[PDB]
Design an enzyme around this catalytic site. Structure first.
Site, PDB file in Angstrom:
ATOM      1  CG  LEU A  68     -15.738  23.746  -7.237  1.00 30.60           C
ATOM      2  CD1 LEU A  68     -16.048  22.265  -6.985  1.00 30.60           C
ATOM      3  CD2 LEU A  68     -15.264  23.960  -8.672  1.00 30.60           C
ATOM      4  CB  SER A  70     -25.461  32.156   4.384  1.00 26.72           C
ATOM      5  CG  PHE A  71     -24.160  28.755   7.328  1.00 23.25           C
ATOM      6  N   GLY A  72     -20.434  29.265   4.238  1.00 20.22           N
ATOM      7  CA  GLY A  72     -19.147  28.781   3.756  1.00 20.22           C
ATOM      8  C   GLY A  72     -19.010  28.665   2.251  1.00 20.22           C
ATOM      9  CB  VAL A  94     -20.714  16.455 -10.114  1.00 20.31           C
ATOM     10  CG1 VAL A  94     -21.550  16.201 -11.343  1.00 20.31           C
ATOM     11  CG2 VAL A  94     -21.041  15.523  -9.018  1.00 20.31           C
ATOM     12  CD  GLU A 106     -24.057  25.956  -9.400  1.00 22.72           C
ATOM     13  OE1 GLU A 106     -24.758  26.878  -9.852  1.00 22.72           O
ATOM     14  OE2 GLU A 106     -23.453  26.088  -8.296  1.00 22.72           O
ATOM     15  CG  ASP A 154     -32.383  24.627  -1.299  1.00 23.99           C
ATOM     16  OD1 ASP A 154     -31.151  24.752  -1.131  1.00 23.99           O
ATOM     17  OD2 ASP A 154     -33.119  25.514  -1.740  1.00 23.99           O
ATOM     18  CE  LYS A 172     -30.912  26.739  -3.995  1.00 25.15           C
ATOM     19  NZ  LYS A 172     -30.797  27.939  -3.110  1.00 25.15           N
ATOM     20  N   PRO A 173     -32.230  24.769  -9.833  1.00 25.51           N
ATOM     21  CG  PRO A 173     -32.834  25.701 -11.897  1.00 25.51           C
ATOM     22  CD  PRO A 173     -33.182  25.732 -10.437  1.00 25.51           C
ATOM     23  CG  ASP A 216     -27.200  22.660  -0.414  1.00 26.77           C
ATOM     24  OD1 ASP A 216     -27.315  22.088   0.693  1.00 26.77           O
ATOM     25  OD2 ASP A 216     -27.078  23.894  -0.561  1.00 26.77           O
ATOM     26  CB  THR A 267     -34.610  28.814  -2.661  1.00 26.71           C
ATOM     27  OG1 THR A 267     -33.395  28.237  -2.160  1.00 26.71           O
ATOM     28  CG2 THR A 267     -34.208  29.919  -3.596  1.00 26.71           C
TER      29      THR A 267
END
Ligand SMILES: Cn1cnc2cnc(Cl)nc21
Lengths: 13, 352
Positions: B51, B55-57, B125, B129, B168, B170-171, B186, B203
């Site tokens: 989905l 960077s980590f996964g 959900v 996004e 963090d 952000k849309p 997140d 970000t």
């Protein structure tokens, strides 16, 4: 002009 | 004054009720914060689709084999969580998610780890996004933007009362649920901070100036970020917009913002007070706290309690074709989840 795609976080800028 | 007698009394009573709510919410959070693990294992889930990726996964749609319920599973490669701030941040994320409870914050269901990866399994959900809906339509009208903004204001009022900073907004991190309301996900950058903190993280387009300038900073960074979000929702692009991070940073620290000609004056006034470099003037950071935001003219039509209670009709409802539908998400490259026979980074993740 600027970034239109998904934006990655930075963990340590 | 701006309010007559009835209105001023109703507002004051409403504000005292908020205090009473937040006091009980802190009591409940602390019980969970002081008493957090290992609530499932990988083979309990079928993996359906990626989905989102970072960077980590990645985050995957998964189906719990026993119950048939669908979930979003965030997978972090322990090795890739290499840098010191990356490790601490992952422990913050899990611990905060297990302890919070609010209608606009995603609910964590399970957490576990194996030789290679960390896993957090949360409510799926399915509406997608905010990011992709915003990019597809261009911009939201001011009432539409305001409906989402009000949810973020209440969520930050909640988080900040618990001494949690989000860091963090952000849309990309705001998912739309089946009733058209927002779910924040997140919590990778969220942290319990009693005063200031110092990590350079977030970000680029959403960073407050004090982060960029390597100053110890506080929860006011989240209020700056709300200004960026509201601007982006209502304009279709953020206020500090450039191809490279260093150029973005230079615009942020300048203290200059320009607005589209279609922004209302009420909206511009709110944004100039959120996108305020001077911390002694930034809304959310003054003696009246969140109330300077909630009582601003741009929010005059907002029924804060009705938003919390989810009584307000949403501006749009994502289409949903059934359990496990992924049509509201973009496609990503799929990579097999490989689990090593040797434990990696066991000491670094003992607490997880
Ligand atoms: C305002 N409005 C009405 N129908 C919609 C569908 N998508 C989006 Cl993003 N917004 C909508």
């Amino acid at each position: 002009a600027g970034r239109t795609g998904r934006r990655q976080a930075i963990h340590d800028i | 004054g701006h309010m007559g007698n009835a209105a001023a009394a109703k507002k004051g009573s409403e504000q005292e009720s908020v205090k009473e709510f937040l006091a009980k919410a802190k009591e409940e959070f602390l019980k969970k914060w002081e008493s957090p693990q290992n609530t499932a294992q990988l083979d309990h889930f079928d993996r359906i689709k990626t989905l989102g990726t970072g960077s980590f996964g990645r985050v995957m749609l998964v189906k719990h084999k026993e119950t048939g319920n669908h979930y979003a599973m965030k997978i972090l490669d322990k090795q890739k969580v290499v840098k010191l701030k990356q490790i601490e941040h992952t422990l913050n994320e899990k611990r905060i998610l297990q302890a919070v409870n609010f209608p606009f914050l995603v609910k964590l269901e399970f957490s576990f780890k194996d030789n290679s990866n960390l896993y957090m399994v949360m409510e799926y959900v399915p509406g997608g996004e905010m990011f992709s809906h915003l990019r597809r339509i261009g911009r939201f009208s001011e009432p539409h933007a305001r409906f989402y903004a009000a949810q973020i204001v209440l969520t930050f009022e909640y988080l900040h009362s618990l001494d949690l900073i989000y860091r963090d907004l952000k849309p990309e991190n705001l998912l739309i649920d089946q009733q058209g309301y927002i779910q924040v996900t997140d919590f990778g950058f969220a942290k319990r901070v009693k005063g200031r903190t110092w990590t350079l993280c977030g970000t680029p387009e959403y960073l407050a100036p004090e982060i960029i300038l390597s100053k110890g900073y506080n929860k006011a960074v989240d209020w700056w970020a709300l200004g960026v979000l509201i601007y982006e929702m209502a304009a279709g692009y953020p206020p500090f917009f450039a191809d490279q991070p260093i150029q973005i940073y230079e615009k942020i620290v300048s203290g200059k913002v320009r607005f589209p000609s279609h922004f209302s004056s009420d909206l511009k006034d709110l944004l100039r007070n959120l996108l305020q470099v001077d911390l002694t003037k930034r809304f959310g950071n003054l003696k009246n706290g969140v109330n300077d935001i909630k009582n601003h003219k741009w929010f005059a039509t907002t029924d804060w309690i009705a938003i919390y209670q989810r009584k307000v009709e949403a501006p749009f409802i994502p289409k949903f074709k059934g359990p496990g539908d992924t049509s509201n998400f973009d496609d990503y490259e799929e990579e097999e989840i490989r689990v090593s026979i040797n434990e990696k980074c066991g000491k670094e993740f003992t607490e997880f």
